[PDB]
Design a protein around this ligand. Sequence first.
Ligand SMILES: [Mg+2]
Ligand SMILES: [Mg+2]
Lengths: 101, 525, 86, 202, 138, 132
Amino acid sequence: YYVDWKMLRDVKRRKMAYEYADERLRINSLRKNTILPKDLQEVADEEIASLPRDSCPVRIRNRCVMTSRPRGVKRRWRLSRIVFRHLADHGQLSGVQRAMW
Amino acid sequence: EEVVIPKKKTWDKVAILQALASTVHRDSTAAPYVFQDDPYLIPTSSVESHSFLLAKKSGENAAKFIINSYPKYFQKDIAEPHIPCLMPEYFEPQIEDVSEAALQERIKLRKVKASVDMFDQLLQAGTTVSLETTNSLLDLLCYYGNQEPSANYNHLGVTWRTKNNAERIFALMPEKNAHSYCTMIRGMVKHQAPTQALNLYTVLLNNRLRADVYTFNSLIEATALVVNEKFEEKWNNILDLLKQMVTQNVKPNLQTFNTILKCLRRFYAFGKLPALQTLREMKAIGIEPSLATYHYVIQLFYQHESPSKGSSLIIYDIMNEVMGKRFSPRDPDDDMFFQSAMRVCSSLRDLELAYQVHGLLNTGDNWKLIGSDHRRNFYYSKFFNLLCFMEQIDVTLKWYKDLIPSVFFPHSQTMIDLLQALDVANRLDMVPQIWKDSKEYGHTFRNELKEEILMLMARDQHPPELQVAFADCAADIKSTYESQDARQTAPEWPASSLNYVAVLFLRAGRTQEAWKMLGLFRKHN
Amino acid sequence: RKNIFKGRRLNIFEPQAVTEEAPETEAVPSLWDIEFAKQLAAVTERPFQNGFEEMIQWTKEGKLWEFPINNEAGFDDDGSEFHEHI
Amino acid sequence: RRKALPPRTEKMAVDQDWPSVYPVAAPFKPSAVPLPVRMGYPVKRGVPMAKEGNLELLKIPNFLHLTPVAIKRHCEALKDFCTEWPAALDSDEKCEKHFPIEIDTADYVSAGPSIRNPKARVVTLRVKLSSLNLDDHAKKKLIKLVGDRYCKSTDVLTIKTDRCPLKRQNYDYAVYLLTVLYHESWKTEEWEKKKTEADMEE
Amino acid sequence: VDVPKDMTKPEITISDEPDTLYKRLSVLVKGHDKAVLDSYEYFAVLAAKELGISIKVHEPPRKIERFTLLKSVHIFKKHRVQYEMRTLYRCLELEHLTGSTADVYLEYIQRNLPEGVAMEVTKTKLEQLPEHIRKPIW
Amino acid sequence: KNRAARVRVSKGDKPVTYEEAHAPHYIAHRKGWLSLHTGNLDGEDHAAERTVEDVFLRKFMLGTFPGCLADQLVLKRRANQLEICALVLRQLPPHKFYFLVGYSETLLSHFYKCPVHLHLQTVPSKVVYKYI
Ligand SMILES: [Mg+2]
Ligand SMILES: [Mg+2]
């Protein structure tokens, strides 16, 4: 079990995007180029929008891998700010110390 | 040009560590690397070593059982480069369909019941089966006797059975080659059923099919075991097989000669001369004898004979031949040579001979062929006993520290031998340290060792400086009797033990302690 | 006073000058030969006696990396020259 | 119950060789180290804690396996796996004279189950142009063709390749660029005569 | 007294391929604690001197990474707790090193690398002109 | 008042070990980091994977050795091998310790696909630094 239902939906969303990542890239290449005829580009827009909704890179949400807090998450450690302090204050993270200057 | 590019040096990726491994040798005071260095976990006796090491070994099997039971929990891979030795394995047939290709998977996965059931289904299906696959199926069944191998979890008498699937399938074979007969004979001889193997060989001769090297290896052992004729009749049969082997142009291997010498050990007298003839044949053929080959030679010539003139000639010639040689494993019984070699030196009481044997063990990687744990303990048991009286005590103590407890734990009888060496060497000052080491070496509550130490310390009068040291050792010995682990069943205080302890606490300026010892005689009668 | 290696021997087998020219290693492996390899290796192998001995066994088995470290070890990219990528 | 055996420090010899005790990198074992070492901030009136049961002496990466006695013994055994640098290539000036091409490559080592670092595929190739056989016209064309990769002060040409996944492919591609640029600077094509007076470097 | 007699068995097959020459080898170790780097430098210098490498050691300037996080789990944005990651650098240059000597030096250095540090190697391999350039082709 | 990873004063009858007796602002001043690895350097990647594996070992070792664990683990990562240093009380028989040592070494090696080293130091009881 994931920590929350929200986390479970994100896993399905990431999995769906990976399957259609290459197909979207090929189709989106036609749209983002102005040398192809406009008639072909209009057909491309219909096909790219016909793909499943969950297969969108923008819909991917970065949460904490421990508590799944939707915001306040450091990208480098993929941890929420509350969890990051909990591990850092106990000395369990290498090279992390209280800033003093 | 005035510049010359030097040629590169190419080495294996593991040889760099071996160069550093040469500089570092074994440590005298260090426990074996397999066990933890923590004192609470350091084994204290040879009994603990078997219990501790096997407990860790069971842990690996216990963990691997979980890995194989639930493969889906270890399919994730983050190893770069890939390590195929850590991925979970599979034992169930990956293909559940009935086909020849799926049948081969079950044979290679050490599955016997699945293979035989699927083979019957294939035969009923009418699809043809390759002869080599049929021979491969027979080999798996013959080796285990149509049974399963030893798995983690699901002697006397002939193990071979007349009503066996091996004979049934062999008859059903449409075409039978030389290999089919060869693998059938070996299984029969292995399972203590040589009567059927010899009969099959007669049919093999009628088929004009040559036998391989391994077939003659089993036949020689089979002929001697089938009947109980005299040596002369057996030797004629043995020579008959060799003559037949030359006719088919078959070159015997190292194991062919080794099994002959082992079987000749029964003839402890009549087989001495024939054993030498086989050994000279090995040199002429080109097969270099291994450690196991000399192991059977020395034991055959070594019997309970007072002169042992012949045995002395045997060992002396061998040691010069083996001197300055590194031996690679070439026989399953190579590990029993070192223990057997030390047995000969024990009777001959030749310290110089033992050093040559011990010097050979320390050359290169020959130390890995010492044997099992009890073989290693026994090998050092006889060797260390020889180091006591055959050499000066000054060098004996050096060997005592190095070999014990780093290599092996001393036995109670071995401790007695060390005490005898000290008494002969007129050195009783090391007795208190011996007792302290004895408790560490699992000899805390050995009745045999306690009596010897007490008798030696109180045998004669000593100067007060030495007497106090004996009294301090005696007090520790007295404490051991008080806290014996045998008190649950029966606590026993020997009559001699009480006497020497009471005498010991007299001359050490411990007259007050002597008064308490007076009342122990009447209490214990 | 006589060496055990000098004396009468069995002359039935002629002294072979050379072994087989072409061993049949690229064929069906006999079960007994594989069993012989297991028996010979099991007796030879002993529990690790030093840290260095544990390193070399792991290195051959693939547990440890092959020093010096190259980041492209084990990945030759299908053995393709730069032309298939340019 | 089970008791605690005395530490081997008592049995340790005075003149025993240390590296035999620690052949490889191992954590600080209090029983295996004869040195009485105390660390940690002391109490207001007290002394720092002992070496037994102290985590502070366990976190530190010890250097007991790299003692100077062991270093000399370790390095001396490794001297077999070496070959001497040629004596004629002593001055760095002669190295340029006999070898005009230097190639920069990088390897990265990090703690983890993986070694794949995408930054290890870079190959830097530097060639001194004064050691080549360019003509007056060919050299001027090469500078105008390679762009900013040529330094006008040090007269060095730097080629960097990153598209190839592997360092060997980049190395083969890097040398491919160097040779194709040399063979092209000598091709005085017909349109080259259409030079403008404002494009002349001198 | 009892020691394993001749327990050394390495092989060094000298092939016919010319060895690779490196103009200059650079090693840059990075870590969090100066004390480990100070001792590691001493180990590397001592081994390098014995092999006869004539190395030079310099300390690159350090850099400090800082980031700020909220203190409480709800409101109270006027109170912050800051953190700091310090990476200390140390560079060891190797000049006039052969390919055969480079391999053993690096692997010996890499195997004894402390767990709290990592390093990057910049090898300046030198070689002659390519065949097409050296061989006169217009 | 700050409360992160602190033990409050309650008379003088509660023992405290060295790790728990120092406030978090003493990190890199009086006590070091319990884990050391390359992930949190300046220009090094692969930092999140190390963190999650570190947390799992904090939960696995604590449950594998119930009650007999003295204090926090120490994790060292060299090359591709993982070293775990632990302090364990004299609670289980030595037979069980080797069983768990073998069980832990094999299971973690086949889960993280990397060699694992597990070194143990045994103490009679929890080491006390202040109070008591
Ligand atoms: Mg919840
Ligand atoms: Mg977003």
